[PDB]
């Protein structure tokens, strides 16, 4: 699959793409306002994620730190990023179908649209001012709005036993972004696309 990742924010983001134990394509890159990065993701990739990182510093060897979404201090991410991170998630070519979603399960940092550029399905978006409205206990100094599992580490918020319900904190995310996952056992907002679709991930889509 081809993913075009576009930064429509007025600020620089450092995009990242990983499946948890390996980079996808180059794994990360700086995107100034308006810049686009096209990556190729191998067919059959399960559990891929794309996210933005904010307020990064990197030296000439690609080592440093970001205030949101840092993946162990690397420009080119091999692992997933530290919350809070709005997540574009996908599994490709699973029995002839692609599955995509946006997730707020690891919090929110940057607004995002995740849309197919090929026919046969619809896109999803979370573009509300979650950071501005974020409850005080979830607000991350670095920027962003953490999920309640990250902050409080309870079995209920983290759904440790595979049994959990919605919470005041999950309902906050869901009210502002109904098409994104707000907790582990949320009614799925997963979209099913034809296998081998192509996609566009746009940061700050209403900017
Ligand atoms: K936006």
PDB file of C-alpha atoms and ligand atoms in Angstrom:
ATOM      1  CA  UNK A   1       0.000   0.000   0.000  1.00  0.00           C
ATOM      2  CA  UNK A   2       1.047   3.622  -0.558  1.00  0.00           C
ATOM      3  CA  UNK A   3       0.437   6.111   2.261  1.00  0.00           C
ATOM      4  CA  UNK A   4       0.759   9.833   1.605  1.00  0.00           C
ATOM      5  CA  UNK A   5       1.367  11.629   4.896  1.00  0.00           C
ATOM      6  CA  UNK A   6       0.670  15.355   4.782  1.00  0.00           C
ATOM      7  CA  UNK A   7       1.244  18.012   7.416  1.00  0.00           C
ATOM      8  CA  UNK A   8      -1.428  20.730   7.068  1.00  0.00           C
ATOM      9  CA  UNK A   9      -0.615  22.063  10.555  1.00  0.00           C
ATOM     10  CA  UNK A  10       0.929  25.541  10.868  1.00  0.00           C
ATOM     11  CA  UNK A  11       3.708  23.919  12.964  1.00  0.00           C
ATOM     12  CA  UNK A  12       6.361  21.308  12.157  1.00  0.00           C
ATOM     13  CA  UNK A  13       5.654  17.694  13.055  1.00  0.00           C
ATOM     14  CA  UNK A  14       7.907  14.679  12.978  1.00  0.00           C
ATOM     15  CA  UNK A  15       5.880  11.883  11.400  1.00  0.00           C
ATOM     16  CA  UNK A  16       6.530   8.291  12.484  1.00  0.00           C
ATOM     17  CA  UNK A  17       5.541   4.933  10.983  1.00  0.00           C
ATOM     18  CA  UNK A  18       6.147   1.612  12.723  1.00  0.00           C
ATOM     19  CA  UNK A  19       4.679  -1.844  13.307  1.00  0.00           C
ATOM     20  CA  UNK A  20       6.115  -2.075  16.837  1.00  0.00           C
ATOM     21  CA  UNK A  21       9.176  -4.223  16.162  1.00  0.00           C
ATOM     22  CA  UNK A  22      10.296  -2.511  12.936  1.00  0.00           C
ATOM     23  CA  UNK A  23      10.105   0.753  11.040  1.00  0.00           C
ATOM     24  CA  UNK A  24       7.744   1.090   8.097  1.00  0.00           C
ATOM     25  CA  UNK A  25       9.662   2.601   5.192  1.00  0.00           C
ATOM     26  CA  UNK A  26      12.177   5.111   6.642  1.00  0.00           C
ATOM     27  CA  UNK A  27      10.304   5.115  10.010  1.00  0.00           C
ATOM     28  CA  UNK A  28      10.210   8.884  10.542  1.00  0.00           C
ATOM     29  CA  UNK A  29      10.842  12.257   8.969  1.00  0.00           C
ATOM     30  CA  UNK A  30      10.425  15.959   9.665  1.00  0.00           C
ATOM     31  CA  UNK A  31       7.374  17.555   7.941  1.00  0.00           C
ATOM     32  CA  UNK A  32       7.263  21.324   7.861  1.00  0.00           C
ATOM     33  CA  UNK A  33       3.902  23.009   7.280  1.00  0.00           C
ATOM     34  CA  UNK A  34       2.544  21.792   3.933  1.00  0.00           C
ATOM     35  CA  UNK A  35       5.110  19.017   3.326  1.00  0.00           C
ATOM     36  CA  UNK A  36       4.170  15.504   2.179  1.00  0.00           C
ATOM     37  CA  UNK A  37       5.939  12.183   2.715  1.00  0.00           C
ATOM     38  CA  UNK A  38       4.980   9.148   0.628  1.00  0.00           C
ATOM     39  CA  UNK A  39       5.783   5.733   2.096  1.00  0.00           C
ATOM     40  CA  UNK A  40       5.346   2.175   0.845  1.00  0.00           C
ATOM     41  CA  UNK A  41       4.026  -0.396   3.329  1.00  0.00           C
ATOM     42  CA  UNK A  42       4.520  -4.065   2.501  1.00  0.00           C
ATOM     43  CA  UNK A  43       1.278  -5.980   1.725  1.00  0.00           C
ATOM     44  CA  UNK A  44       0.127  -8.164   4.617  1.00  0.00           C
ATOM     45  CA  UNK A  45       1.420  -5.738   7.298  1.00  0.00           C
ATOM     46  CA  UNK A  46      -0.526  -6.271  10.544  1.00  0.00           C
ATOM     47  CA  UNK A  47      -0.680  -3.702  13.365  1.00  0.00           C
ATOM     48  CA  UNK A  48       0.910  -0.723  11.584  1.00  0.00           C
ATOM     49  CA  UNK A  49       0.626   2.745  13.104  1.00  0.00           C
ATOM     50  CA  UNK A  50       1.310   6.286  11.897  1.00  0.00           C
ATOM     51  CA  UNK A  51       1.518   9.241  14.262  1.00  0.00           C
ATOM     52  CA  UNK A  52       2.908  12.750  14.645  1.00  0.00           C
ATOM     53  CA  UNK A  53       5.522  13.835  17.139  1.00  0.00           C
ATOM     54  CA  UNK A  54       5.741  17.410  18.408  1.00  0.00           C
ATOM     55  CA  UNK A  55       8.563  19.644  19.680  1.00  0.00           C
ATOM     56  CA  UNK A  56      11.504  17.423  18.746  1.00  0.00           C
ATOM     57  CA  UNK A  57      15.216  17.967  18.799  1.00  0.00           C
ATOM     58  CA  UNK A  58      17.524  15.600  16.848  1.00  0.00           C
ATOM     59  CA  UNK A  59      21.278  15.720  16.296  1.00  0.00           C
ATOM     60  CA  UNK A  60      22.981  14.851  12.993  1.00  0.00           C
ATOM     61  CA  UNK A  61      22.948  11.129  13.902  1.00  0.00           C
ATOM     62  CA  UNK A  62      19.102  11.049  14.253  1.00  0.00           C
ATOM     63  CA  UNK A  63      19.170  10.878  18.083  1.00  0.00           C
ATOM     64  CA  UNK A  64      17.216  13.205  20.382  1.00  0.00           C
ATOM     65  CA  UNK A  65      13.866  13.731  22.094  1.00  0.00           C
ATOM     66  CA  UNK A  66      10.280  14.738  21.323  1.00  0.00           C
ATOM     67  CA  UNK A  67       7.728  16.079  23.819  1.00  0.00           C
ATOM     68  CA  UNK A  68       4.911  13.913  22.386  1.00  0.00           C
ATOM     69  CA  UNK A  69       5.176  10.524  20.679  1.00  0.00           C
ATOM     70  CA  UNK A  70       8.913   9.930  21.240  1.00  0.00           C
ATOM     71  CA  UNK A  71       9.982   6.424  20.092  1.00  0.00           C
ATOM     72  CA  UNK A  72      13.066   5.862  22.274  1.00  0.00           C
ATOM     73  CA  UNK A  73      14.904   9.007  21.174  1.00  0.00           C
ATOM     74  CA  UNK A  74      15.198   8.144  17.438  1.00  0.00           C
ATOM     75  CA  UNK A  75      14.203  10.127  14.361  1.00  0.00           C
ATOM     76  CA  UNK A  76      13.551   6.852  12.479  1.00  0.00           C
ATOM     77  CA  UNK A  77      11.119   4.954  14.709  1.00  0.00           C
ATOM     78  CA  UNK A  78      11.360   1.159  15.101  1.00  0.00           C
ATOM     79  CA  UNK A  79       9.060   1.093  18.139  1.00  0.00           C
ATOM     80  CA  UNK A  80       5.787   2.793  19.024  1.00  0.00           C
ATOM     81  CA  UNK A  81       5.742   6.262  20.550  1.00  0.00           C
ATOM     82  CA  UNK A  82       5.202   7.512  24.090  1.00  0.00           C
ATOM     83  CA  UNK A  83       1.670   8.868  24.788  1.00  0.00           C
ATOM     84  CA  UNK A  84      -0.030  11.114  24.186  1.00  0.00           C
ATOM     85  CA  UNK A  85      -0.405  10.214  20.513  1.00  0.00           C
ATOM     86  CA  UNK A  86      -3.350  10.329  18.156  1.00  0.00           C
ATOM     87  CA  UNK A  87      -2.995   7.064  16.194  1.00  0.00           C
ATOM     88  CA  UNK A  88      -3.737   6.037  12.624  1.00  0.00           C
ATOM     89  CA  UNK A  89      -3.905   2.226  12.767  1.00  0.00           C
ATOM     90  CA  UNK A  90      -4.073  -0.346   9.984  1.00  0.00           C
ATOM     91  CA  UNK A  91      -3.802  -4.004   9.049  1.00  0.00           C
ATOM     92  CA  UNK A  92      -3.464  -4.725   5.317  1.00  0.00           C
ATOM     93  CA  UNK A  93      -4.461  -7.653   3.097  1.00  0.00           C
ATOM     94  CA  UNK A  94      -6.107  -9.694   5.832  1.00  0.00           C
ATOM     95  CA  UNK A  95      -8.203 -12.153   3.911  1.00  0.00           C
ATOM     96  CA  UNK A  96      -8.594  -9.734   1.030  1.00  0.00           C
ATOM     97  CA  UNK A  97      -9.584  -6.747   3.195  1.00  0.00           C
ATOM     98  CA  UNK A  98      -7.754  -3.770   4.712  1.00  0.00           C
ATOM     99  CA  UNK A  99      -8.785  -2.560   8.195  1.00  0.00           C
ATOM    100  CA  UNK A 100      -8.213   1.052   9.319  1.00  0.00           C
ATOM    101  CA  UNK A 101      -9.086   3.194  12.329  1.00  0.00           C
ATOM    102  CA  UNK A 102      -8.105   6.208  14.368  1.00  0.00           C
ATOM    103  CA  UNK A 103      -7.536   5.638  18.064  1.00  0.00           C
ATOM    104  CA  UNK A 104      -7.485   7.898  21.143  1.00  0.00           C
ATOM    105  CA  UNK A 105      -6.649   4.897  23.391  1.00  0.00           C
ATOM    106  CA  UNK A 106      -3.143   6.351  23.874  1.00  0.00           C
ATOM    107  CA  UNK A 107      -4.397   9.924  24.084  1.00  0.00           C
ATOM    108  CA  UNK A 108      -4.368  12.789  21.602  1.00  0.00           C
ATOM    109  CA  UNK A 109      -1.685  15.214  20.445  1.00  0.00           C
ATOM    110  CA  UNK A 110      -2.467  16.331  16.871  1.00  0.00           C
ATOM    111  CA  UNK A 111      -5.750  16.273  14.889  1.00  0.00           C
ATOM    112  CA  UNK A 112      -5.902  13.847  11.990  1.00  0.00           C
ATOM    113  CA  UNK A 113      -7.811  12.634   8.966  1.00  0.00           C
ATOM    114  CA  UNK A 114      -7.200   9.079   7.703  1.00  0.00           C
ATOM    115  CA  UNK A 115      -8.791   8.577   4.277  1.00  0.00           C
ATOM    116  CA  UNK A 116      -8.519   6.026   1.429  1.00  0.00           C
ATOM    117  CA  UNK A 117      -7.448   7.511  -1.903  1.00  0.00           C
ATOM    118  CA  UNK A 118      -8.888   4.517  -3.758  1.00  0.00           C
ATOM    119  CA  UNK A 119     -12.534   3.542  -4.135  1.00  0.00           C
ATOM    120  CA  UNK A 120     -14.632   1.283  -1.908  1.00  0.00           C
ATOM    121  CA  UNK A 121     -14.678   2.751   1.634  1.00  0.00           C
ATOM    122  CA  UNK A 122     -14.856   5.974   3.647  1.00  0.00           C
ATOM    123  CA  UNK A 123     -12.319   7.791   5.793  1.00  0.00           C
ATOM    124  CA  UNK A 124     -12.308   8.649   9.486  1.00  0.00           C
ATOM    125  CA  UNK A 125     -11.320  11.879  11.271  1.00  0.00           C
ATOM    126  CA  UNK A 126     -10.644  13.260  14.728  1.00  0.00           C
ATOM    127  CA  UNK A 127     -10.264  17.038  14.330  1.00  0.00           C
ATOM    128  CA  UNK A 128     -11.749  18.538  17.523  1.00  0.00           C
ATOM    129  CA  UNK A 129      -9.865  20.715  20.006  1.00  0.00           C
ATOM    130  CA  UNK A 130      -9.171  17.886  22.443  1.00  0.00           C
ATOM    131  CA  UNK A 131      -6.068  19.605  23.856  1.00  0.00           C
ATOM    132  CA  UNK A 132      -7.919  22.861  24.598  1.00  0.00           C
ATOM    133  CA  UNK A 133     -10.792  21.006  26.298  1.00  0.00           C
ATOM    134  CA  UNK A 134      -8.667  18.314  28.027  1.00  0.00           C
ATOM    135  CA  UNK A 135      -9.565  17.621  31.704  1.00  0.00           C
ATOM    136  CA  UNK A 136      -6.879  18.971  34.046  1.00  0.00           C
ATOM    137  CA  UNK A 137      -5.869  15.513  35.308  1.00  0.00           C
ATOM    138  CA  UNK A 138      -5.183  14.264  31.753  1.00  0.00           C
ATOM    139  CA  UNK A 139      -3.351  17.343  30.425  1.00  0.00           C
ATOM    140  CA  UNK A 140       0.264  16.551  29.496  1.00  0.00           C
ATOM    141  CA  UNK A 141       2.720  19.423  30.275  1.00  0.00           C
ATOM    142  CA  UNK A 142       4.655  18.578  27.132  1.00  0.00           C
ATOM    143  CA  UNK A 143       1.494  19.098  25.125  1.00  0.00           C
ATOM    144  CA  UNK A 144      -1.416  16.820  24.434  1.00  0.00           C
ATOM    145  CA  UNK A 145      -4.141  15.039  26.338  1.00  0.00           C
ATOM    146  CA  UNK A 146      -3.240  11.687  27.911  1.00  0.00           C
ATOM    147  CA  UNK A 147      -5.553   8.695  28.139  1.00  0.00           C
ATOM    148  CA  UNK A 148      -6.636   7.638  31.638  1.00  0.00           C
ATOM    149  CA  UNK A 149      -4.758   4.286  31.525  1.00  0.00           C
ATOM    150  CA  UNK A 150      -1.460   6.127  31.062  1.00  0.00           C
ATOM    151  CA  UNK A 151      -2.201   8.565  33.900  1.00  0.00           C
ATOM    152  CA  UNK A 152      -3.856   6.340  36.508  1.00  0.00           C
ATOM    153  CA  UNK A 153      -2.795   2.727  35.727  1.00  0.00           C
ATOM    154  CA  UNK A 154      -5.994   1.002  36.934  1.00  0.00           C
ATOM    155  CA  UNK A 155      -7.457  -2.252  35.663  1.00  0.00           C
ATOM    156  CA  UNK A 156     -10.663  -0.382  34.697  1.00  0.00           C
ATOM    157  CA  UNK A 157      -8.953   2.275  32.555  1.00  0.00           C
ATOM    158  CA  UNK A 158      -6.401  -0.145  31.048  1.00  0.00           C
ATOM    159  CA  UNK A 159      -8.979  -2.957  30.569  1.00  0.00           C
ATOM    160  CA  UNK A 160      -6.404  -5.335  32.075  1.00  0.00           C
ATOM    161  CA  UNK A 161      -8.814  -8.272  32.564  1.00  0.00           C
ATOM    162  CA  UNK A 162     -10.471  -7.758  29.138  1.00  0.00           C
ATOM    163  CA  UNK A 163     -13.552  -6.587  31.056  1.00  0.00           C
ATOM    164  CA  UNK A 164     -14.057  -2.859  31.382  1.00  0.00           C
ATOM    165  CA  UNK A 165     -16.722  -0.266  30.661  1.00  0.00           C
ATOM    166  CA  UNK A 166     -16.709   3.305  29.361  1.00  0.00           C
ATOM    167  CA  UNK A 167     -15.592   5.932  31.891  1.00  0.00           C
ATOM    168  CA  UNK A 168     -15.987   9.691  32.359  1.00  0.00           C
ATOM    169  CA  UNK A 169     -12.566   9.998  30.686  1.00  0.00           C
ATOM    170  CA  UNK A 170     -13.379   7.739  27.700  1.00  0.00           C
ATOM    171  CA  UNK A 171     -16.669   9.618  27.172  1.00  0.00           C
ATOM    172  CA  UNK A 172     -14.685  12.901  26.962  1.00  0.00           C
ATOM    173  CA  UNK A 173     -12.698  11.613  23.950  1.00  0.00           C
ATOM    174  CA  UNK A 174     -15.753   9.962  22.392  1.00  0.00           C
ATOM    175  CA  UNK A 175     -17.964  13.063  22.655  1.00  0.00           C
ATOM    176  CA  UNK A 176     -15.410  15.134  20.711  1.00  0.00           C
ATOM    177  CA  UNK A 177     -14.299  12.340  18.285  1.00  0.00           C
ATOM    178  CA  UNK A 178     -17.040   9.683  17.890  1.00  0.00           C
ATOM    179  CA  UNK A 179     -15.254   8.009  14.937  1.00  0.00           C
ATOM    180  CA  UNK A 180     -12.098   7.210  17.009  1.00  0.00           C
ATOM    181  CA  UNK A 181     -11.624   4.426  19.582  1.00  0.00           C
ATOM    182  CA  UNK A 182     -11.998   5.940  23.072  1.00  0.00           C
ATOM    183  CA  UNK A 183     -11.203   2.824  25.130  1.00  0.00           C
ATOM    184  CA  UNK A 184     -10.156  -0.782  24.526  1.00  0.00           C
ATOM    185  CA  UNK A 185     -13.690  -2.283  24.308  1.00  0.00           C
ATOM    186  CA  UNK A 186     -15.304   0.625  22.459  1.00  0.00           C
ATOM    187  CA  UNK A 187     -17.843  -0.423  19.812  1.00  0.00           C
ATOM    188  CA  UNK A 188     -15.410  -0.716  16.852  1.00  0.00           C
ATOM    189  CA  UNK A 189     -15.026   2.332  14.629  1.00  0.00           C
ATOM    190  CA  UNK A 190     -12.936   0.130  12.321  1.00  0.00           C
ATOM    191  CA  UNK A 191     -13.450   0.708   8.578  1.00  0.00           C
ATOM    192  CA  UNK A 192     -13.166  -2.174   6.106  1.00  0.00           C
ATOM    193  CA  UNK A 193     -11.566  -1.271   2.771  1.00  0.00           C
ATOM    194  CA  UNK A 194     -10.767  -3.418  -0.312  1.00  0.00           C
ATOM    195  CA  UNK A 195      -7.410  -5.165   0.071  1.00  0.00           C
ATOM    196  CA  UNK A 196      -4.474  -3.186  -1.363  1.00  0.00           C
ATOM    197  CA  UNK A 197      -6.127   0.237  -1.017  1.00  0.00           C
ATOM    198  CA  UNK A 198      -3.964   3.380  -0.794  1.00  0.00           C
ATOM    199  CA  UNK A 199      -4.380   6.056   1.853  1.00  0.00           C
ATOM    200  CA  UNK A 200      -3.742   9.658   2.898  1.00  0.00           C
ATOM    201  CA  UNK A 201      -3.014  10.677   6.482  1.00  0.00           C
ATOM    202  CA  UNK A 202      -3.452  14.422   6.956  1.00  0.00           C
ATOM    203  CA  UNK A 203      -2.407  16.177  10.145  1.00  0.00           C
ATOM    204  CA  UNK A 204      -4.550  19.211  11.029  1.00  0.00           C
ATOM    205  CA  UNK A 205      -7.053  18.555   8.221  1.00  0.00           C
ATOM    206  CA  UNK A 206      -9.216  21.628   8.852  1.00  0.00           C
ATOM    207  CA  UNK A 207      -6.181  23.997   9.017  1.00  0.00           C
TER     208      UNK A 207
HETATM  209  K1  LIG B   1      -7.678  20.277  12.254  1.00  0.00           K
END
